[PDB]
Amino acid sequence: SMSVKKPKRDDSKDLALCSMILTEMETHEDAWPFLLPVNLKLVPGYKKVIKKPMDFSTIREKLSSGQYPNLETFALDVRLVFDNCETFNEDDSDIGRAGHNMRKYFEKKWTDTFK
Template sequence: MHDHVDAWPFKEPVDARDVPDYYDIIKDPMDLKTMSKRVESEQYYVTFEMFVADAKRMFANARTYNSPDTIYYKCSSRLEAHFQSRVQSGLQAGAKIQQ
């Protein structure tokens, strides 16, 4: 997901100096860097569902803060579609392995 063309707005936490009211509106921020650190720690994501929940929160935050006509909102929607497709194919592959 990190290398996807629409991932660029989500690679780092939102900088409050650039977007002063972001953390007033978004109370539970998420970004790809934070998710990567959590994956690398091997302790935070006890289940795959926890990882998916953080990704969904990242997408929802982008759509909550930004209006539909912004590039950030559009990137969020496209990246989420890519993410969901990858998750679905991973789940299907896992189901085939278990059969």
């Protein structure tokens, strides 16, 4: 509260560390469904159903231009990518399975790096 603060958690490396995690996600062999925005002209249903599209290239641009106020807003966009994938894709599809694998991969890096 006013003039009463918890001790300062060192956040000065968060930008660099989110950038490393994002690099690792970009280079994973199962990243291919997520590298670029889904083409809203060519994928029937996507525009109406997926209210907030997100992809790795869009996160990378946001990260590079100061559009994440903190490391939690970065994690929310990464999870958005996988939540969107689960909304649109069957679990038993190549893309469905890719999204499960990537979410697992991310959440381990996240815990190991920050928790």
